[PDB]
Design a protein around this ligand. Sequence first.
Ligand SMILES: *[C@H](C)[C@H]1/C(=C/c2[nH]c(/C=C3N=C(/C=C4\NC(=O)C(CC)=C4C)C(C)=C\3CCC(=O)O)c(CCC(=O)O)c2C)NC(=O)[C@@H]1C
Ligand SMILES: *[C@H](C)[C@H]1/C(=C/c2[nH]c(/C=C3N=C(/C=C4\NC(=O)C(CC)=C4C)C(C)=C\3CCC(=O)O)c(CCC(=O)O)c2C)NC(=O)[C@@H]1C
Ligand SMILES: *[C@H](C)[C@H]1/C(=C/c2[nH]c(/C=C3N=C(/C=C4\NC(=O)C(CC)=C4C)C(C)=C\3CCC(=O)O)c(CCC(=O)O)c2C)NC(=O)[C@@H]1C
Ligand SMILES: *[C@H](C)[C@H]1/C(=C/c2[nH]c(/C=C3N=C(/C=C4\NC(=O)C(CC)=C4C)C(C)=C\3CCC(=O)O)c(CCC(=O)O)c2C)NC(=O)[C@@H]1C
Ligand SMILES: CC1=C(/C=C/C(C)=C/C=C/C(C)=C/C=C/C=C(C)/C=C/C=C(C)/C=C/C2=C(C)C(=O)CCC2(C)C)C(C)(C)CCC1=O
Lengths: 67, 160, 160, 160, 42, 4, 296, 130, 161, 161
Amino acid sequence: MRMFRITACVPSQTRIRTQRELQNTYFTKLVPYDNWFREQQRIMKMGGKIVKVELATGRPGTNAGLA
Amino acid sequence: SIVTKSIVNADAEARYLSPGELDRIKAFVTGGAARLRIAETLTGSRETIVKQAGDRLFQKRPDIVSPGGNAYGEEMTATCLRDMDYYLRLVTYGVVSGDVTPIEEIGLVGVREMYRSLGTPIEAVAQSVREMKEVASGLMSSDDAAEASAYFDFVIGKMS
Amino acid sequence: SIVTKSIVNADAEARYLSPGELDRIKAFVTGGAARLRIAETLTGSRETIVKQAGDRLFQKRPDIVSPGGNAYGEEMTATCLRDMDYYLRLVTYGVVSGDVTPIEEIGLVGVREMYRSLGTPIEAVAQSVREMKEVASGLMSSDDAAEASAYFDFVIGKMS
Amino acid sequence: SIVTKSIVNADAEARYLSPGELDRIKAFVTGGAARLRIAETLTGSRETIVKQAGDRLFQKRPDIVSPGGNAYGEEMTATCLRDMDYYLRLVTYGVVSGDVTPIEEIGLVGVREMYRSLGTPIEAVAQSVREMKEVASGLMSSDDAAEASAYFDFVIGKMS
Amino acid sequence: KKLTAGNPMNFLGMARSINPAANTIPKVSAQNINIEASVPRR
Amino acid sequence: RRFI
Amino acid sequence: AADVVPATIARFSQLNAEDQLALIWFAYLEMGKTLTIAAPGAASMQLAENALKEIQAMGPLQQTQAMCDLANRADTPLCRTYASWSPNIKLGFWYRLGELMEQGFVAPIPAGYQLSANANAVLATIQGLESGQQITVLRNAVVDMGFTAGKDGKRIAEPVVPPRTKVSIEGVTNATVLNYMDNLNANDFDTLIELFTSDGALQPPFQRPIVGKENVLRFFREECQNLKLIPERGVTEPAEDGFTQIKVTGKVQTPWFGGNVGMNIAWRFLLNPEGKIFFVAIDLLASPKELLNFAR
Amino acid sequence: ASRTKVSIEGVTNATVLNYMDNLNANDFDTLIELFTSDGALQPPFQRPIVGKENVLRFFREECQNLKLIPERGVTEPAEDGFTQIKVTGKVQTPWFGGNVGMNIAWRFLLNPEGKIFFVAIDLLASPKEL
Amino acid sequence: MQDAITAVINSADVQGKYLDGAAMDKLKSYFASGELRVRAASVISANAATIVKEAVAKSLLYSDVTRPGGNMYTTRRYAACIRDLDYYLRYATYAMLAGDASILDERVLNGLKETYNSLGVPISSTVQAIQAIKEVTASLVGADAGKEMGVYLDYICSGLS
Amino acid sequence: MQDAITAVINSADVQGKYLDGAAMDKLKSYFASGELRVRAASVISANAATIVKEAVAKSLLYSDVTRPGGNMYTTRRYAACIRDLDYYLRYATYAMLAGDASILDERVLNGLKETYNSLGVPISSTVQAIQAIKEVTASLVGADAGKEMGVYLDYICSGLS
Ligand SMILES: *[C@H](C)[C@H]1/C(=C/c2[nH]c(/C=C3N=C(/C=C4\NC(=O)C(CC)=C4C)C(C)=C\3CCC(=O)O)c(CCC(=O)O)c2C)NC(=O)[C@@H]1C
Ligand SMILES: *[C@H](C)[C@H]1/C(=C/c2[nH]c(/C=C3N=C(/C=C4\NC(=O)C(CC)=C4C)C(C)=C\3CCC(=O)O)c(CCC(=O)O)c2C)NC(=O)[C@@H]1C
Ligand SMILES: *[C@H](C)[C@H]1/C(=C/c2[nH]c(/C=C3N=C(/C=C4\NC(=O)C(CC)=C4C)C(C)=C\3CCC(=O)O)c(CCC(=O)O)c2C)NC(=O)[C@@H]1C
Ligand SMILES: *[C@H](C)[C@H]1/C(=C/c2[nH]c(/C=C3N=C(/C=C4\NC(=O)C(CC)=C4C)C(C)=C\3CCC(=O)O)c(CCC(=O)O)c2C)NC(=O)[C@@H]1C
Ligand SMILES: CC1=C(/C=C/C(C)=C/C=C/C(C)=C/C=C/C=C(C)/C=C/C=C(C)/C=C/C2=C(C)C(=O)CCC2(C)C)C(C)(C)CCC1=O
């Protein structure tokens, strides 16, 4: 399957958390192609900044053979 | 193809192909010649198949090529026939690959959305493929028709 | 309804209704008689609203009332006018309620599934409602037409 | 404002604003003139509002301006008046926007943590805002004061 | 049985009175269409 | 198509 | 190698702006008899609704100029708005204008105009095509009108031609009424008002009487532009206090207050024993035309 | 006054005569059956009204306790089979403006079956507006 | 996201000052345009699917983009393209209603340019389709509202470069 | 959820009928009551915390429930009990505004008995507390509005009993 590798910085808005939060604040993750639109919308609504997007897996322009 | 589908099913379980996944790959590859024949018969008479299919569709749905219909007018009938040739081309892809994945990836994923935007009645597009299956079924032996029909019918079912 | 809509908005936030919401409710109840008059107008002229709008629709979309069209024949034509009657009645529900949820819950959730199952061209339904909006608008003053138009446009915008 | 709240609500359902939400927006912009009047009143009387509020608070709470009190001394008591001015400025922001959101985001999220760190008795801050509300409500009509009360109360409520 | 609301029988008279005109039988022919040259180009 |  | 549809489209492109415009109008007349009918529901005509209101609101001279601008590819906001539409919308837009031309809402082609020799032949070719081929040629005839910033231009513009008798009444020969009807059909409100007393009053159709010279004067400037009212017969008598009460009827060949080109009208003139009009009543007579009806 | 039926000179249509009797009797419910399912009514100085329910709403909202006296009416055929009747009379109660001395006219476009497909009430306003 | 009011508030708050005469003027101007924005928003929502239908037919259909080899070829990618345009129009409508493009920065132009460059979606064709949306909308909402919608649709276009 | 208006609409819809004169009478009756409901709702919301405080004082405090081993004992359970009373009052205010109790059957009573019976919450004591809330709010909003709020608080109590 095609996959994106995305970097995002998601701040905290309505609370001052006391545990360590760096892991869920600035992170890089693999997102399946079929989840990126939804996932990108969710991060945007949570105030997150999408800092980097890459097509980690797959090729641009494929018509057949997406797995 | 049938090979990619088998591999995906096996990789989902982090395991090697089971006996059945291997049997069907072996059976499919040995049958490659018959599939390539059907693909060739469909490709050869594609012009005949679509135009004969279009005329039968219009006798079934005269509204679509009458004022107000989506395919009304020469250029629109030509586009409608153009689409029938698309879905014939994808049916040949399905036959040779032994898998309906190429058909879905190219011409059935989001088709309902695309034809909604364009205003085409998709059930009439299903009927068009029902006509091409009939016309194509007459150009081949009964067994070449039974395998070809399976991929036509998958298109018919996905477009309802 | 405007009252239910604001209550569910307030409950979703586990709060009492805000002053802005309470003022909107106060205005709606105090302008109540004006809305009911518009609904009375639509209700009383429902026969002519549907007939004229239906007459216009088939002129605008003759294919739907031609062989192979979904509304071909007097009986299918009757069901199409029935459906238009359904949607007009819903518009009057929206008018008196000051909210579209009565329209949405009765006749827009799953409308695409229903009409694709029946084979009805949904965009022509959007056209039929559109036609009813002109006929209705021409039976009342501009300010009254604007209040009813919002609900006509909501139905049109959802099916289309 | 209620504009952002409506859009955020509409964007959660990936939909356009419904007629009811648009009507609420239209009412909100019409009442804008009244909102601006109140905010101008508070802004024009801010120096007297804070000064009198401070006197009222200190009589009620001599401990805070006594030795050992957080606001003890001229330098600390002036800083305490500055905080009262901050929250008056925030209440003005809430007035013009018709919502408490600017107040929450600038001055009430983590407010307890900050003042606890500074050794400021939060209940005495809550009292100061009550004093400002009393003085401010005396400079405007009953309706205008009732309008502005929601924002004064919101600050008090979040400081318990 | 007495007709009830929503029954399409209630609108048969309206349908007959409107008497919508069907399109004429089309005379289009697939065999005489050159698909490549007829599809619009934009 | 008849509904009767 | 017939290839009729594109070859026919080629011939249309060669016709001059005037012939192209004349052709499509005469094609509109054949629609439903030798040409295909329209299906405006298959176009997103709401895109052209605003442009169609502007044309209706125009004067007769401006309307014809607007359509000549379309055929001449002149650079005007309407032509720019036209060029942004889709082919079906364009054809449906022209269809609406043809419908309104027949309905009299928009100015007609020059009186007694005749289609040129070349244009008539191209029309006949279209007439012989199948329905689907006709709409395709018709779509392409208008697809290129309006203004597009690029490769476009017409050799010859086709300007509209630059362009009042006494009205006969059966049984009525009162000059006061004669001046009014002629003045009314002439849109000479500056003169028509001088037949109404300073304390006169007029009753428009579906309206209460309006009392006042300035009010009646303003009404003419507003709701009677380019309006043609024909009286056919009437009768004159004195009624009361020397006032003369004339009841002349007729027909209106122009849409008016929801009326059609063929709606009958009536006037009840009430004028002074010594001259001009003190009151007048106008009432469009209802008939199978009931498209001016409101609800409550 | 109530114990006499309405009389109109030159006209004998039952639908009109029943209309004139029911209208005065004030029984709007009996009155509206005379109107066709498509029937309309034009109040003086106003556009027509379509729909029985809407026509009634005008009657019960604007036509309360009024007395009209038909005086002399004429009948003639109308196209498509409609029978056009014209009736001239006078008002008694104040009505859309004008008291007693106004002249009313009732143009009836009767449906062959007999129902009132259209009726127009016009006040021939006297030189005094009232 | 911030609307026109919250934008004016934030400008004063960052400097820690009350709303002065100039800030009140900006608030007044936004209030006076409110009825026109809500009018245009109602029109767009009623014709939103039609707007995208006609913008696509005008800018993308019957071209290399939709033929084999074009990025909009395949029903899968055609539908993906139709969705994007549908979201562009709706978010441009929010921005017009709010009178501020911040929602476009946060919920449209936040990773979108880099997603498009990863998948090979042609920006040039996307900008033309959006521009066609701007032309189609102006024909529906008039000129004063259509210019306002064009401001924010242009913001998206330049955001994608 | 259904309010007074949608109760009229639903009764017409299930028969497939437009709203007739009698239905418009019902809508008018509710519109005439709108001002009373709105004013009462604002007074209750501004006094909600104090309404519950006085209801608790006269109905729950200094009894077995607050002594150690009692269901209201421990700060968490006391706080939960106040929160529950806040909920009942807030949903009664919704119901009073809507003029319809259906919200109570849907968003309050659904599974409430099962919840309390599994936790050991005393049903009689909560009913006595709600009745105290009914008495207190009546003395704040008047007899007419107090009796209207009494219907929907009594509706909750009858649901729990
Ligand atoms: C204080 C000396 C300065 C300052 C601080 C400041 N920080 C933030 C936000 C965050 N801080 C962190 C840091 C950490 N999170 C962890 O889990 C750990 C590892 C143990 C660290 C060091 C993070 C992750 C954030 C963002 C998420 C969050 O807050 O939970 C802010 C707020 C930023 C904003 O605009 O929201 C501030 C103000 N700011 C100054 O000016 C001081 C010099
Ligand atoms: C014919 C049986 C029916 C019909 C067809 C019809 N289609 C269009 C327009 C388009 N059809 C497509 C389809 C595809 N493109 C793809 O890449 C794939 C997968 C290979 C498919 C299936 C597209 C993209 C278009 C848009 C035009 C373009 O090529 O860019 C039309 C024309 C509609 C119009 O108004 O332009 C028609 C007529 N119509 C019917 O009524 C039949 C049921
Ligand atoms: C249409 C005008 C053009 C076009 C579009 C196209 N886009 C994709 C794929 C994606 N588009 C997005 C877009 C967004 N994500 C967001 O958060 C926002 C804000 C609302 C937008 C607009 C995303 C995330 C994707 C990838 C994920 C997904 O599509 O679900 C494609 C598909 C490409 C592919 O290889 O499948 C296409 C075709 N393409 C054109 O040629 C037009 C010019
Ligand atoms: C004394 C330092 C402060 C003070 C006390 C005070 N408390 C009450 C009333 C109650 N206190 C409680 C407390 C608890 N219940 C628990 O379960 C726990 C943990 C085990 C605690 C701490 C309760 C439940 C009550 C309500 C009465 C009851 O017990 O039934 C009062 C009386 C208030 C009144 O008006 O009745 C007082 C005076 N008051 C002060 O001013 C001191 C700061
Ligand atoms: C079926 C179908 C449809 C198709 C619908 C169709 C086929 C629609 C076609 C409609 C047609 C044929 C419209 C033509 C209109 C022509 C006009 C108004 C010309 C006016 C000329 C003027 C004013 C010139 C006057 C002149 C002046 C001034 C001069 O001075 C002298 C010269 C001249 C006389 C020229 C749709 C597209 C709707 C949807 C799809 C679908 O299925």
